[model samples]
Target: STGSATTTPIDSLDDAYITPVQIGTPAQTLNLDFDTGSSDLWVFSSETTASEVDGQTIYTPSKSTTAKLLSGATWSISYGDGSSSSGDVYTDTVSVGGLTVTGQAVESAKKVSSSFTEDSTIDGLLGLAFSTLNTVSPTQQKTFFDNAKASLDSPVFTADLGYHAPGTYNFGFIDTTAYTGSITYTAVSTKQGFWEWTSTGYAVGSGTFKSTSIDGIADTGTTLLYLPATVVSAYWAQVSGAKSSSSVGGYVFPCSATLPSFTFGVGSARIVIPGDYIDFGPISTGSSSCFGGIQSSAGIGINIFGDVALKAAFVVFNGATTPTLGFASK
Candidate 1:
């Protein structure tokens, strides 16, 4: 089966991307973050404390006849930064963009971090990464894409992330009209359970194309384009009044500054990100200083080509035997 879904930015700064997903019998719909960074189909549910939830929609298991408790299963996930969320697991009929999968593992959030509580815009996350990354214990479950791949017309799904506007996530078949120009294909390494790939190199605006192999992950769940310090500094240096602030923990510049565009190579294909896209947004409300969307990934140990980079192109996550990634200019 082939299907498509709309992905909308959660915040004005394009902080996160969320998609509507249907779960259980009567179809309890919730807006979930389509995260390629992790593998867990978790949701805000009745299991979550009332205080832990705010404006987010909750998935009530008892309300659905098709829902079944996945006994002896539990999950506890934390990001690299250490914020954690833990919960029990359940099985439900999950559907996205009309693509349905039966008995899908649905982790019900029993607890959430403050960073998640304050953000009422997101109910939970739907992971598209390899199922090996799933946090569920005892018996790890497959991701929505993995469970549906067998019945899919093709073992591939595409992500069209947007800057400020709504984008799309298409399964089984790539929508040609969503992109333009020839698609560039590259090898993807899933050793770490991520859509890890390498870039030929990058170039600052009007600058020479630096010839080097840059390894990174295509992550729609992350907000910024995190690269090595050298590459990040190269772009920030071109912008006036840009500096790495210890207090802010990133590069910030005057909102009035004009940022230079950034370009990355993919198998001879060049995807250009407009300068304005690099100017993330102001550091704070009513602040004239804005943060750079492209930041240094020095301590992180991994480069993440997040929404900032993915939004500039159409990316394909191939779930074939020998997985490969595809990029195209749009």
Candidate 2:
């Protein structure tokens, strides 16, 4: 059987971006993005007057026959990437699988023009990350987990990430038949927002981790994994032709050799990332090419283990239990 995990939904008023529970009928599909950066749920609506909505999805409330706006107030959200949208405050019935929720809060954006909207293959975003980051009124915000908790058959919703492909984020429950072993949970910390932590150190190939003292956070929103400056420089030094591609922002090594495998030390556990994942998914430039997930953003500041890193293990963010990240396998 497919294993399941407990999910908690919360209000988006705390932050501007987070995962939102997409509300639609059993006959209609409503996909949402579980974001950590902002806290807000946005869908395309008939009232939207924006000139464009390239990368975002539009929702037609008139077609649902059961949708309603929570209030007549208008709403809008803009991202750092220079894209934005505005619409209306609304409420409707939201369903996932066999679960049905009513009077759920939602936003119907009349306009969305963020760079991410260009071709992100997303209709709207579901802010499952945090309430503190949600832009909606903290009093009115809601998350997918928060909404699913009461209806879920179990008390937990787990995420089983499969490689670079689309990993499954189950609500209400998890499928046990998908795995061959037991699940392990890391102790939860009382920290707030994104329950992030530090990596003791990192190892490349057969080389032992140099510092074993570095700290990092686990972030699912980021698509790539990034280490600190010193760590990045040290790791890239190993590649014979691994030159600093200043233009692309990260290290660009020659594709001729088999790159070494890397691992991040997490307290008693060791998280290893294969070479293929690091070197693969890169884009091509005028003269040289680069890896898809590798890039340097010193100012973005924190070293985050993005979607690339989370894909390797089972991750659980227990908001109800001391705000800690737990790891396990199905």
Candidate 3:
């Protein structure tokens, strides 16, 4: 009933983390992005138009004896960044690490956006968000975690995302070795189908923590930390020669600029993000301009604590009761 999985980051692109997942009987293995921002386990499949699939592997349901097509059922999903995919549904066995869930809904993609087709490494998406957000039609499909939770020793999962390094996703059990200090718990508001929560406040550099409450979601699928434009401007103001770049978009600063650390208030706990993490690499190859990892959440409505922010701490997504989030220093 207990299981764990290894999640690895793609080379050079620290955008999303991918983990191994098996689908159907005989186990068709695919590397999928374990995203917390959305719900729906979807993958590139035989149903996908050949032109829509680039260098990605396709899952053929016909190869699995346990695959069952859910008649009249279909699914479509879009991401905050505008990437999308859609397809038919099938019930099959899905295994992650050592835990296996039978009759888990597997949405096979018949169409994919250019973003998905261009990404060669990600074969599909394994949603870790709440079941309430699933996009299946006719009847909503449950996520693999939801389908397997009842059989688990504990209905909890921990995300240990590392910076330019390997991380682990543990289920039904917490690895004390993954983080140090006691985990700070925060009540999550899932009205928006995300690990949404309100931060008491935040601060830039060594400055005093502000008392402004910020509403945001802990999203592993997103690459950058998105906050209110005013908040973003305030942070950049502390850095020398930092500005909103028209060419690169968002706020940009000299790559050598000494950046300030950012701290987020969770209950009484303060999660401090190192200054270096705020510098999101160069805008382009050999460019002196670098994009700030923290940007405006204008169009998105709610702020997004993406991978850059999440990697600063060990996160726990507790779905057993009130759906709480626990964080601790890595």
In terms of lDDT, the best-performing candidate is 1
User: Please, what are the lDDT tens digits per residue for candidate 2 over residues 37-141?
Assistant: 455777655665645655445677767767776665565677533567666777677754445567666778766674445544556666565655555542556
What lDDT, from 0 to 1, does candidate 3 have?
0.89
Residue pairs with backbone atoms closer than 3 Å in model 1 (clashes): none
- Give the lDDT of residue 73 in candidate 1: 99
Clashing residue pairs, candidate 3? none
TM-score of 3: 0.97
Off-target runs (Cα >4 Å) in candidate 2 are 1-22, 55-57, 72-86, 138-140, 174-182, 187-192, 210-217, 280-282, 285-288
**C-alpha TM-score for every candidate:** 0.99, 0.79, 0.97
lDDT value, residue 57 of candidate 3: 80
Span of ten consecutive residues with least summed lDDT in model 2: 8-17
Cα RMSD (angstroms) for every candidate in the order listed = 0.8, 5.9, 1.2
Which residue segments of model 1 deviate by more than 4 Å? none
lDDT of 3 by residue, 206-270 (tens): 99888898889989888889999888988999999999976767899998888899998888888
lDDT of 1: 0.92
lDDT, candidates in the order shown: 0.92, 0.57, 0.89
